[PDB]
Amino acid sequence: EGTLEVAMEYRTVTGVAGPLVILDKVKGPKYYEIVNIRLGDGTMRRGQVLEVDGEKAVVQVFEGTSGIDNKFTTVQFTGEVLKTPVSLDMLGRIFNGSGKPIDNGPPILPEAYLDISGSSINPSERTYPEEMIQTGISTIDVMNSIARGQKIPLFSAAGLPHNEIAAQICRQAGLVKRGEEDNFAIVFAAMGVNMETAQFFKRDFEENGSMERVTLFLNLANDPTIERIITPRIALTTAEYLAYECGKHVLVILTDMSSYADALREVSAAREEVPGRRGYPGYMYTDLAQIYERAGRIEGRKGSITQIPILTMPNDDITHPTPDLTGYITEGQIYIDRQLQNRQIYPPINVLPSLSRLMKSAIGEGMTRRDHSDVSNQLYANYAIGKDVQAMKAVVGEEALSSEDLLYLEFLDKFERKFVAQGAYDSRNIFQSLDLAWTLLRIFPRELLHRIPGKTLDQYYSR
Amino acid sequence: EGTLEVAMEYRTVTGVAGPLVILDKVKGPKYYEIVNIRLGDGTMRRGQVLEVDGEKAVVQVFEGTSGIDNKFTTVQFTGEVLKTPVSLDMLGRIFNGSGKPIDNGPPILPEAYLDISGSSINPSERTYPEEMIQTGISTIDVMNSIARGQKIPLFSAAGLPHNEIAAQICRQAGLVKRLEKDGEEDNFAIVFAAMGVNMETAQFFKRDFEENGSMERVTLFLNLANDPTIERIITPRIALTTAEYLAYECGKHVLVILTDMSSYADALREVSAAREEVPGRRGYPGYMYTDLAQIYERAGRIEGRKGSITQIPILTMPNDDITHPTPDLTGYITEGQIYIDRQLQNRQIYPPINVLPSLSRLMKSAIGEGMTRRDHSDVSNQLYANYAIGKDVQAMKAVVGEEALSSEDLLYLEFLDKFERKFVAQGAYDSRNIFQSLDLAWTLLRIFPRELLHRIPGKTLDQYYSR
Amino acid sequence: YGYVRKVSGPVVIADGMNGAAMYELVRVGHDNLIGEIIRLEGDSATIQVYEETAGLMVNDPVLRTHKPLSVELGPGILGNIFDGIQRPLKTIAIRSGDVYIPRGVSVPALDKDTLWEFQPKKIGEGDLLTGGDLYATVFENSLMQHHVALPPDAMGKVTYVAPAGQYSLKDTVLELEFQGVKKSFTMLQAWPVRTPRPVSSKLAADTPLLTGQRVLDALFPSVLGGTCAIPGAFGCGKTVISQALSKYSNSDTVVYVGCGERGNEMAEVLMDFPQLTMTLPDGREESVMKRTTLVANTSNMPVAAREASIYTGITIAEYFRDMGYNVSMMADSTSRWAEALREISGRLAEMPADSGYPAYLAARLASFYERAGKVKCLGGPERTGSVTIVGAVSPPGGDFSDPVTSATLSIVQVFWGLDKKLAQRKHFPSVNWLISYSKYSTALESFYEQFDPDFINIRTKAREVLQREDDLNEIVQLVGKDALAEGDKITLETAKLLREDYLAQNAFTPYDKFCPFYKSVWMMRNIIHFYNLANQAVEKGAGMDGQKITYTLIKHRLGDLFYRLVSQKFEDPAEGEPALVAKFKKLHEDLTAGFRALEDETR
Amino acid sequence: LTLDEAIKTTNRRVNALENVVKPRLENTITYIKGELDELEREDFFRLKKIQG
Q1: Distance CA B344, CA B159 (A)
Q2: How many Cβ atoms are within 10 Å of D20's Cβ, its own excluded?
Q3: How far is residue B167's CA from residue B182's CA, in Å, rounded to a whole number?
Q4: Coil, strand, or helix at residue C186?
Q5: DSSP H or E segment with residue C82
Q6: How far, rounded to the nearest angstrom, does the alpha carbon of residue B316 sit from its chain's CA centroid?
Q7: Smallest Cβ distance to A30: which of C57, C300, C481?
Q8: How far apart are CA A61 and CA A68, in angstroms?
Q9: Pairing verdict, β A133-134 and A8-10
Q10: What is the rounded distance in angstroms from the CA atom of residue C228 to the CA atom of residue C436?
Q11: Do C42 and B14 touch (CB under 8 A)?
């Protein structure tokens, strides 16, 4: 091997402003070379070199630029991009936003260093998702299903129980099983959460007994804002290593996707870049793509990555740039309703916008029923017509609902009452739920049904 | 003219970015000096000198900047501004954006060279539009008439058939005075200049003027969308110069059709951004108003010559609005505005002209006792008032209910219906004289009672109420 | 030769670049990354590096290729997935088992070792060939019939023509000599991607693009070689429409390119096209995958290469066009290309004219769209190829005031307006009849007249019915379900039928997967003729009661025929043209007879 | 009859007129600010950097 070399140690910082430290007289820089700045007081912090020009090099530190002296701070060039020591032993532990251990345990002994921001899977190599996932929630598996490799987020405004829903999904997660060594190895990114929520997550995962197969990546709001952006990267790097190069399927969870976007806006505004909508950086589509567009089933390997992010509509508006880009990229969405939450429904999923783009392949002959697609279509379409009936009744009166409209309103009411609701630990299997789903479909006349053919449901039999 | 000088030839290109090249060590560079660029491959491009400072000179390139290199690019300074060749032979031919002929014929044998952006006319020597032309379109002919030397821009948006109506206007251009009007001098000599048009629209226009039989009269300048942008900022100027020669120094009435002013504004914005100066409203160059004024004010009758220029620049509202800088400045400058309405297009009326926002400042002078009947202005005013009151009444009936509408309310709604049905609607080739159109307008007006026609003077009513 | 000076994301500045010319391919770093000169200042120059720039170091070697951006457009590209720089994905994966895309690999564009059955044409020794002359043809695979053509800007007399047989791409075939010098040609042809492939003369198009979808085929048609735009806001999944067009178009070849498209979608394309077959007149089973090429680079790929992706796609489509075929292209998510332009220009500090997008956006987009069309090809024989461009402009936030949407709708000929309302209601096509508009109606008038003169009239009637339905919906919402005129009620009726049956296709069921044009005409004629019969009944019914007031009773008594009208969409096209035309005949005549007899009854 | 008509008008107003106008005002405010102010300030900053 070519002879080793020790890192250069510079002191020529020649200007500081904002989150940027400017160097000079640098001999042989490297773009995105990771630098570990040591201040005069002796403390250390890291950062990235975002631009290289001439002998100059512009560094954006991690822990902030406070307390840096233009004549006493020393910069060292590791000469490599950021690498996370991924290993199989990383399971069942917790880490800070930067990945430092926080589980009162020893640092990870790496099997092999893997550069984060890894190269894309060859598009030809990528294969379509084909197997359903038992998240442990009824309404997700019954309609708007999930395939083992399909990405789909959870849309939920502020104040909604989406974090509790994520915890329930993580603890109740499992394969359909219709094994354990290669079973779901859940990676749980945590991008910018409150300390109370962090303690909630830690206690829920520790007590659940799933800590034997789950790795957390906690990052609080008190952490440096830039450290928030590398978190959902380190998490996906570890997920890629565990799934593709280690075999076991991974069900990655990202929390507060909006917080990552806020972390991006702050960093970009500091960098003084061209702004997109709402002042968010223009290339956010690219950087949300680099995060989302990783889950999938590579052909040459039996692993599988499944992506379940959680967003947060800032103004409770789906037209906000973050949900807009997500819905452009993420292949479907699960929607949570504030009004249904007000109606005291624990899983307040609003089925009208809750669609799975890959549900057509999630259903099949290996799993579900031959009428699953038709039942989903009917219970997804008649709900909108029942909502329109409710609106017409509101704008005219109770007598406005005719013999057909009244049936739609009753269908909507019974649907919001029985089918959607579920227990806090309800593993309602597909068939028992689809029975009452067809009961709801049969609340409406069995011949008035327009889209569905009666023979498809006739393949199924009542009782 | 005793002795001349051969043009200089510098190989210095200190910088190339965007559509611009930055020449250096250029001694004695004129402003708006026209430069010919000999590349390393030997191809020749022509461009203009945007600004001069010291020995530096920012040169914009018409044909794009996809082959320049410092080592081998050579540029010559002709020491003159653009002077397009002009002659009577320029008629009946189609030309590229820069004026290079593409009719498979020979280049123009010039009668003279005219500097672009011709000499400013002494304002004390201009004259108001004297006579008006019959446009054939009922909406244009009856309200907001077009006078010889008028500046009427057609305001449209994407999808609206502004190109089709432009071709129809080119077909129906004609005089109206007492229905009296060879007329080779009186021949309108249409100078149609289109910038950044779809190739389909280009073939459409070419075939339309080929078939119309006016190929011995019309003259087309084209700067397609795939053609370089910089060429588009000169094409309308070339058209205006050619029209000015064919009208003033050649004694011919000339009509000008400029297409897609929004495309011209786009080229102006591109040039300004490439030069990196302070932007204005919506990032546009701050002098866009001056450019539009110089591109518009080059039309009108002139006392000392028998010719004239009447221009109809079709304009595209970008987001179907008017507060946009281009339509706003055009309204500030142009003495008229004809609107094409998306609502009219939705009901599938081939001419979608909405007369309510449409207006000509010189309509009163355009209409004359020889030009039209004495009641023509009364017809226009009555139709305006009736349409406005009918729209307000339709809104009132919508909010309160159709049944709650009064008798006069139903009368106004019926007037709106028959108006938008028979009056505005016209065929692809409907070409009717002004008089029968005015008679049918009096039919529509006499549908209303005499008392409701308060705006109309009584004398004109007695002249043309019963008929 | 040269060395790097500044690196800033995708943009890289190299010093010592004196002889460089604009848009010349360049090799950067020890990994020899692809780059194109964009801005040259002094001895230095600006390079956009299509590969990822992370990890560069100052003074990395910079090598001039002296050649602009070029694609190897020889035979064999059909049925192969190519990157934005047109590198072969499958060969890369086979050569390096690592499924991850390597950085610094130099796989050639096409294999130099494939043997192709080469059939020389009627050309003879000493014949005067010109640029674009089809001296021969070659069978890449079934239904390929690849025509090897002489590259333009080449002429001479045939000094030697190769005999029929298998040939490597190195092998010379033609040895034409123009100015005494005998130049030898091969199958490989490289084209400067930015410069369009020349044509003899563009010409108007009058062959409609048959999508197989009722709404697009009838309401807003497009001609072969036209230009189309599909905004498709988030949640619409326009890619299903694009894939349906690719599968069931009448085009000879499909060039699908996805800039910013999801990797899953390309996986779906490559995994579903080979099984799906199209039936040619010969009738043999044949895979669409051979007819289709994929130039897509996923969103994970560097954004510098969006422009290269789109231009390679358009030049490959042009190459197939010059072969005489009719090729259609879909450019998924050109909004990603707009964002790529913004990101590149942002580093150059060019002043943002509008919403961050550079000023020279309309120009580039207009060039890309204007490369479309139907042209008379060069050389002999007298081919007339065509390229159809159907791009996609995803509106950020779902607002059509977006600059990319504004420019596209400004320069596009036919526009298909997707809407969030129909997508939410699970309509499936989600093609809004209002905003969508086709400027090709005038051109296709001759085709409509020769096919069926009734089509234009029923189309205009359907448009009027839809507009009246929208107006009546607004008026009713303002007032209420009361005071509905019997004629207005009958108008809202069968307009609901239009929306429920004709305007919607399942797109995932065998019957609604592909809608033949004749059955679409029959279905529209049935609906509009029922409407006309209803109007006639309203005109005369032995009193205003039986005429129009009893329209509800008519619906009650004609319920079976109305149900047949609504179910006519459910029938599959596999029954064949005679079965469908006979069924539509009997349905229309039964409807007319029952309506007239019931109108005769009590009147 | 009069009370029914008036109640219908009031309910229609409360359900459609304001419920459509308020989103129109919100969209106008959002577009105006986040486009004009943002891009004008960006242009000014780019000019300042150019001079710098």
Answers
A1: 12
A2: 9
A3: 22
A4: strand
A5: none
A6: 11
A7: C57
A8: 11
A9: unpaired
A10: 11
A11: yes
